[PDB]
Each structure stands twice: as structure tokens, then as C-alpha cells.
């Protein structure tokens, strides 16, 4: 009856490997370095914890943000960190420099996240009041900022591909305009909910998407709800697809509905376990990302830790 019901993708099950409990507070951003040698693990204690990617050992700390930094990324062509938050301090932490020289500027209010382009010499920062600053690399200024948000921008993204926009304000108003034009050629006045899960699915185009209620698929060209997923009522706080087309969306309420690649509905329907220090109903999946080798999933819950959900050997996963 349901889509992909008589075609169960015989993928392996997840398996927790270890939890690196070294942060002090709810983890804000978690990302693995491109070289498979660093693991940028942010925390609300005003200290970016850049640990090891696969080992998870304490590599080094990095302060500079006065408050919780809800934005952290690492560039490819620009070997330097990229932080962003309410502190308005971008930690340009190079692997050899180990300092803060970015000096993110342009947002006249708080910041909830940012994203640097992989190829184009541009970026994006989710300002608080109404701004969407396209922080140009080696410019520290939003010369061409696609400002189409009336509240705190949920997320931001831009690259050499041609969806041309990824963003959305907190006042139920998004700007799916052309990044080259700058003007609001296409106002994405939809998704009034807290849309904070837009992970790349299979192909660059006609991929999957998410939402905090009834998550479904999307499309890079013009958008389309093709892969009709199940009723993902869980508030998907983020999503980082696997290396082999699979998709996983971390939930803000702890119930991370794990959907298959093309199935859409929750295949595992996993949840966030109650940590020993955490309360009964207080936790929530803040980040979830597969490693560079896609061997262990780095899932950072609200217990100030990062779990390594490795894969197990089993084909007994056939369900109608």
C-alpha cells in the first residue's frame, strides 16, 4: 500500500560505537573535516571543540564566541574554519594558523547559522532581525546579500549548482530567488513551520527534503514533492545524507525518524536515548552527520556528547 513497501532496501542496521562526552552544553554544530582528520564539534559553552574525526580524541579547543555558536563549517578551497552565531565572531581557524581572523560582519543582530560555498567565492549567514549576509570570502562583508527574510533566517546555502537559493526566515517567509540576481525574483512564501532540515538526498537534482511535520522530497530545479515520505511529525532539526544516497534527519524532540534513501518513511524510527545526566524529556538530536568514509555516523545529542553510530552486518531488514 505504502511506497517502497514491497521493495525494502536491504541496508544494514546502525550500531553505536562510542560517545565522546567532552562538551559543556547543548551541542550547536557538528561537522567532520574534509581530510578525515578533524571533527569540528561546537558547544554552547563558548568553546568550539575540534576533535578527531574517526578517533574522536581531544585535538584542541577554540574560543572567541561570547555565546553559543549555532553555526560552524569548514571550507575546502579556504583551509580555515567558519563560525557564526549571536556573538558575531567568525573563527577563521586554519589547521596551521589556529586563530580567529575571519571577522564576520554584516548582520546587525544575532545569528543562528551560516554556510560557505564550496566553489563560488561567496557564503551566507542567517542573521537575526531581517538580514541574510552573503559574506564574500576574503571580504568580511555582504556586498551582494540576498536579503529576503523578515526574521531569524533558519538556514542558508549556495554553491555552483543551479537551485539558485536555499534560505528561509522565521516569520514564515523565504526567498527562493536567483543568487546572481540578488532581488526577490521568486519569494518562497511557504513553509510557515520551522523548516530546518534540507539534507542532499540521492542525485543533485530531484533529491529529497524534510520538514518538522509531514516531511517529503523536494527538487533542485523548481522543486517537487516526488518521494512522498511518511508523517514525520518530529521536528527535524537538521539532515545529513549518507555517502550511498541514504538520508538521516536529526530531530529536535529526540525522536529522529530514520528514513531510507528512496522510501521516505521512517525505516528505523530511532530515538534519542536518555543520557545519565540528562532528564526524562529534555534531550533532542542537534546534529547528525556521516563521516568522510560513511563508516560511522556522528550524532551529537543534547547531552554534550557525540555518538558514533557504526553499521552492523545483517540482511534481516525486510519489511513490507
Amino acid at each position: 500500500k505504502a511506497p517502497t513497501m514491497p521493495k525494502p532496501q536491504w541496508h544494514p542496521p546502525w550500531k553505536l560505537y562510542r560517545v565522546i562526552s567532552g562538551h559543556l552544553g547543548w551541542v550547536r554544530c557538528i561537522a567532520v573535516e574534509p581530510g578525515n582528520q578533524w571533527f569540528v564539534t561546537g558547544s554552547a559553552d563558548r568553546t568550539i571543540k575540534i576533535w578527531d574525526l574517526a578517533s574522536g580524541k581531544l585535538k584542541l579547543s577554540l574560543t572567541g564566541h561570547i555565546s553559543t555558536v549555532r553555526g560552524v563549517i569548514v571550507s575546502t578551497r579556504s583551509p580555515y574554519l567558519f563560525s557564526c552565531g549571536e556573538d558575531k565572531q567568525v573563527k577563521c581557524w586554519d589547521l596551521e594558523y589556529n586563530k580567529v581572523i575571519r571577522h564576520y560582519h554584516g548582520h546587525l543582530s544575532a545569528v543562528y547559522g551560516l554556510d560557505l560555498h564550496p566553489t563560488i567565492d561567496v557564503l551566507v549567514t542567517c542573521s537575526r532581525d531581517s538580514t541574510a549576509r552573503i559574506w564574500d570570502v576574503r571580504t568580511k562583508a555582504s556586498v551582494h546579500t540576498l536579503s529576503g527574510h523578515t526574521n531569524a533566517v533558519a538556514t542558508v546555502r549556495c554553491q555552483a549548482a543551479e537551485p539558485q537559493i536555499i534560505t528561509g526566515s522565521h516569520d514564515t517567509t523565504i526567498r527562493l530567488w536567483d543568487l546572481v540576481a540578488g532581488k526577490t525574483r521568486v519569494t518562497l512564501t511557504n513553509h510557515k513551520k520551522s523548516v530546518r532540515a534540507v539534507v542532499l538526498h540521492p542525485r543533485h537534482y530531484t533529491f529529497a527534503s524534510g520538514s518538522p511535520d509531514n516531511i517529503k522530497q523536494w527538487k533542485f530545479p523548481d522543486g517537487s514533492f516526488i518521494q512522498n515520505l511518511s508523517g514525520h511529525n518530529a521536528i527535524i532539526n537538521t539532515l545529513t545524507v549518507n555517502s550511498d544516497g541514504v538520508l538521516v534527519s536529526g530531530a529536535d524532540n529526540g525522536t529522529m525518524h530514520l528514513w531510507d534513501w528512496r522510501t521516505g518513511y521512517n525505516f528505523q524510527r530511532v530515538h534519542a536515548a536518555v543520557q545519565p545526566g540528562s532528564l526524562d524529556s529534555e534531550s533532542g538530536i542537534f546534529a547528525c552527520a556521516f563521516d568522510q568514509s560513511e563508516s560511522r555516523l556522528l550524532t551529537a545529542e543534547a547531552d554534550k556528547t557525540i555518538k558514533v553510530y557504526r553499521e552492523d552486518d545483517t540482511a534481516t531488514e525486510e519489511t513490507h
Binding site: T119, I120, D121, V122, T139, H144, A160, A161, V180
Partner: peptide, 23 residues
């Protein structure tokens, strides 16, 4: 991804023009 390169070149030219105008 030739169109990607074209879009990137257009973005670079626009950024350079904006820098020359402001700076």
C-alpha cells in the same frame, strides 16, 4: 558542470564590479 563555471564566473565578475564601485 560548464554552466556551474559560467555562473561562478558571472558571480566573480559581479563581485569585482561591486568592489570597484564601493571600494
Amino acid at each position: 558542470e560548464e554552466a556551474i563555471k559560467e555562473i561562478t564566473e558571472k558571480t566573480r565578475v559581479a563581485l569585482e564590479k561591486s568592489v570597484s564601485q564601493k571600494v
